[PDB]
Chains A and B, each alone.
With several copies, the nearest count.
Chain A
Amino acid sequence: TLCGAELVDALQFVCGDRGFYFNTGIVDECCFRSCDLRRLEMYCAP
């Protein structure tokens, strides 16, 4: 489970130098339920 400050760290590890994306969320998909690297790379910039 990636919750709270852990989720930011995990998305930073996954994003690298790509950066995040902009323009019922990330908490439910990764805090309440198990999440993997296969569905956390889709929050990064294309």
Chain B
Amino acid sequence: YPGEVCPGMDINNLTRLHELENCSVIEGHLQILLMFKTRPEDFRDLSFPKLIMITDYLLLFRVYGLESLKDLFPNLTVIRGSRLFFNYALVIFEMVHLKELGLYNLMNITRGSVRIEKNNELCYLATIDWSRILDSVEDNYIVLNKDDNEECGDICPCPATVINGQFVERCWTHSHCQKVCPTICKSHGCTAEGLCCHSECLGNCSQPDDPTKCVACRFYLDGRCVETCPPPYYHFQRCVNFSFCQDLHHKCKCHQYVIHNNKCIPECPSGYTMNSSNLLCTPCLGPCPKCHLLEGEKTIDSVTSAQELRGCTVINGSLIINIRGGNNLAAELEANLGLIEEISGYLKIRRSYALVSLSFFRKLRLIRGETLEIGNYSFYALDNQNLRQLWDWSKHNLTITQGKLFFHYNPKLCLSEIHKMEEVSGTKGRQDIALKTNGDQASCENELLKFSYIRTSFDKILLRWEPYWPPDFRDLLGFMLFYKEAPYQNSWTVVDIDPPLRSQNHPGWLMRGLKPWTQYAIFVKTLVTFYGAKSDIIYVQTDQILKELEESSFRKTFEDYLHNVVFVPR
């Protein structure tokens, strides 16, 4: 490494950026912001080629004249993503004259996504393949740039891969392109001749098959990278020795520091206590969970908000899950705030579009409720479009001391699961629950419609299921069958069927239009006026309209009225 180790920094004046001159690694984050007076003649002759590694994230915002990062960051190779910026490890925002990215040497980002948006000159964007840089591409958001109503042509200087079946050349700048290394080394890094360096290395390296000649690696001790640091050196966020952790602890005594599991971490984990003799943390018989919240409030809108509660066990305040965007954040949410058994306050879920379940509270025992929402709610829900399941009630025990539940608009959440809460939580009755907005588009009809007869032909199938009748048989408007040529057991075709006439005239339908010797997946579900039943999906191989509801209700009303009048008791 041609330089020392730097902390993160935020750079008005461009001359502030000179501190990067003697730098190799920034273990924090690099933010360059709000130079409103610079112009490209201040960026022609400023280069920092000895920057090796960025740990957390790189953000550039409102910089005038930075048309390319080739000079600034020609050797920045890995942005790992220990600490993110709203689920993102690379954010470039509202750059005015940036047209070409330029950091061709960047290889991997271990954890995170990329946000490049509202950049009015950047165009070298469709030619960078992020599958070779990130593990996921469905989370990135590049939305508004120069190439939303225009194309610069993307003049390549190089490997090509498919977008949607068509191969396109992948390039970085006018003179460089992406290094799509072969799968022989998945991440170790192929060189010019195709040889790959040692497994404990990421991206780029000098001499193949050597732990020492690498520049970026998946720990690192001294001029070489290893899978685990040697016994004399404890792990870091680096492989540091006894000097580093004690030096930081004495400098603070601002974060304290503790040696634990051969890893120098800031604060002792749950149930572990510190003795002043040595920085090793020992188990403590006295219970001691960790999280003080200023103003007693914390809105979990991203990974960064969730990450401040990592290893947390007791929340000394309230949580407001407010995830937006539709991105699957379940795994990260569990990994961050899944250890919080106790929460001293109220829990709220507003406008969580992506949330399909709250199981990521894998250990959640006691919601206390000392402080409550307006209207005195200790569990709340509104506009959770894709929420269909709370904690798995078969094996999860939850306790709520005070407050009442609330459920306004959860279109895919069944009322049965909602009602199952009151039995287990302990709040038998305290209510708030809108019956026509929970599960309104859900197919969670609890009753079972068992199949009875199956007869398959070369182009047709014959189905017959056990009769179903609600307590008032006039409520059964009819039936609805669905089939679809499913490729494996792991949209449907909706049809309408009239109800059978009682007497049993075993109800069923005669399948038609099926192709020979192919499998089909099917189920039939009732429609009723307000119950409801569905047939469990079986597999077999081929060996403005709401006025009709009003008409049926009217038909019941007059027949009901006639009986009430013409039949009189003695």
Binding site for B on A (CB under 8 A): 1, 3-15, 17, 19-28, 31-32, 34-38, 40-46
Whether A43 contacts B460 by the Cβ 8 Å rule is no
Stretch at the interface among B129-137, B419-427, B468-476: B468-476
A12 to chain B, nearest CB (A): 6
Complex interface: chain A residues within 8 A of B10 (CB)? 22-23
Q: Which one of B459, B507, B566, B570 contacts A46 once the chains associate, using CB atoms below 8 Å?
A: B570
B498 to chain A, nearest CB (A): 7
**Chain B residue nearest to A31 in the complex (CB):** B472
Whether B12 contacts A37 by the Cβ 8 Å rule is no
Whether B474 contacts A4 by the Cβ 8 Å rule is yes
Whether B473 contacts A43 by the Cβ 8 Å rule is no
**Could you tell me which residues of chain B, from 456 to 478, have a CB within 8 Å of some CB in chain A?**
457, 459-460, 462, 471-474
Complex interface: chain A residues within 8 A of B500 (CB)? 38
Whether B12 contacts A20 by the Cβ 8 Å rule is yes
Q: Is B175 interfacial (CB-CB < 8 Å)?
A: no
A4-B473, A8-B62 as given contacts; A31 in contact with B560, CB under 8 Å: yes
Q: How far is the CA of A42 from the CA of B460 in the complex (A)?
A: 19
**Could you tell me which residues of chain B, from 208 to 256, have a CB within 8 Å of some CB in chain A?**
none
What are 13 A-B interface contacts by the 8 Å CB criterion? Answer: A1-B471, A3-B473, A4-B472, A5-B94, A13-B460, A22-B566, A23-B10, A25-B564, A26-B569, A27-B564, A31-B560, A36-B497, A43-B569
Complex interface: chain B residues within 8 A of A15 (CB)? 36
Whether A13 contacts B567 by the Cβ 8 Å rule is no
Q: Is B428 interfacial (CB-CB < 8 Å)?
A: no
Q: Is B13 interfacial (CB-CB < 8 Å)?
A: yes
Q: Which one of A1, A10, A17, A20 contacts B460 once the chains associate, using CB atoms below 8 Å?
A: A10
Chain B CB within 10 Å — which of A7, A15, A23, A25 has the most? A25
A7-B563, A21-B569, A27-B564 as given contacts; A36 in contact with B509, CB under 8 Å: yes
Complex interface: chain B residues within 8 A of A3 (CB)? 471-474
Nearest 3 pairs of A and B residues by beta carbon: A19-B12, A25-B564, A37-B510
Q: Report the interface size class on chain B.
A: 35 or more
B341 to chain A, nearest CB (A): 28
Complex interface: chain A residues within 8 A of B512 (CB)? 10
Complex interface: chain A residues within 8 A of B498 (CB)? 34, 36, 38
**Chain A residue nearest to B34 in the complex (CB):** A20
Whether A25 contacts B567 by the Cβ 8 Å rule is yes
Chain B CB within 10 Å — which of A9, A20, A21 has the most? A20
A44 to chain B, nearest CB (A): 8
Whether A42 contacts B570 by the Cβ 8 Å rule is yes
B290 to chain A, nearest CB (A): 24
Whether A12 contacts B36 by the Cβ 8 Å rule is yes
Whether A42 contacts B569 by the Cβ 8 Å rule is yes
Complex interface: chain B residues within 8 A of A14 (CB)? 462, 510
**Could you tell me which residues of chain B, from 552 to 570, have a CB within 8 Å of some CB in chain A?**
559-560, 563-570
Whether A22 contacts B474 by the Cβ 8 Å rule is no
A36 to chain B, nearest CB (A): 7
Q: Is B544 interfacial (CB-CB < 8 Å)?
A: no
**Chain A residue nearest to B470 in the complex (CB):** A1
Q: Is B493 interfacial (CB-CB < 8 Å)?
A: no
Whether B12 contacts A43 by the Cβ 8 Å rule is no
Q: Is B37 interfacial (CB-CB < 8 Å)?
A: yes
A8-B62, A17-B37, A19-B13 as given contacts; A25 in contact with B505, CB under 8 Å: no
Complex interface: chain A residues within 8 A of B560 (CB)? 27, 31
Q: How far is the CA of A6 from the CA of B474 in the complex (A)?
A: 11
1/0 per residue, CB under 8 A from A, across B30-60: the answer is 0001101100000000000000000000000
Complex interface: chain A residues within 8 A of B568 (CB)? 21-23, 43
Whether A24 contacts B564 by the Cβ 8 Å rule is yes
A20 to chain B, nearest CB (A): 5
B199 to chain A, nearest CB (A): 41
B513 to chain A, nearest CB (A): 11
Q: Is B203 interfacial (CB-CB < 8 Å)?
A: no
Complex interface: chain A residues within 8 A of B570 (CB)? 21, 42-44, 46
Q: Which one of B12, B457, B507 contacts A13 once the chains associate, using CB atoms below 8 Å?
A: B457
Q: Is B508 interfacial (CB-CB < 8 Å)?
A: yes
A8-B62, A26-B563 as given contacts; A1 in contact with B472, CB under 8 Å: yes
Whether A20 contacts B567 by the Cβ 8 Å rule is yes
Chain B CB within 10 Å — which of A3, A7, A35, A41 has the most? A3
Whether A45 contacts B12 by the Cβ 8 Å rule is yes
**Chain B residue nearest to A13 in the complex (CB):** B457
Q: How far is the CA of A35 from the CA of B329 in the complex (A)?
A: 35
A19-B13, A34-B498, A42-B569 as given contacts; A10 in contact with B564, CB under 8 Å: no
**Chain B residue nearest to A11 in the complex (CB):** B567
Complex interface: chain B residues within 8 A of A6 (CB)? 473, 502
Complex interface: chain B residues within 8 A of A40 (CB)? 510
Q: How far is the CA of A42 from the CA of B567 in the complex (A)?
A: 10
Q: How far is the CA of A41 from the CA of B455 in the complex (A)?
A: 14
A39 to chain B, nearest CB (A): 8
B416 to chain A, nearest CB (A): 23
B568 to chain A, nearest CB (A): 6
A21-B569, A37-B508 as given contacts; A13 in contact with B34, CB under 8 Å: no
Complex interface: chain B residues within 8 A of A26 (CB)? 563-564, 567, 569
Complex interface: chain A residues within 8 A of B569 (CB)? 21, 26, 42-43
B62 to chain A, nearest CB (A): 7
Complex interface: chain A residues within 8 A of B566 (CB)? 22
Task: Taking A14-B510, A22-B566 as given, write out 7 further A-B residue pairs in contact, using a Cβ cutoff of 8 Å, ordered by the A residue number.
Answer: A6-B473, A13-B455, A15-B36, A19-B13, A20-B33, A22-B568, A26-B569
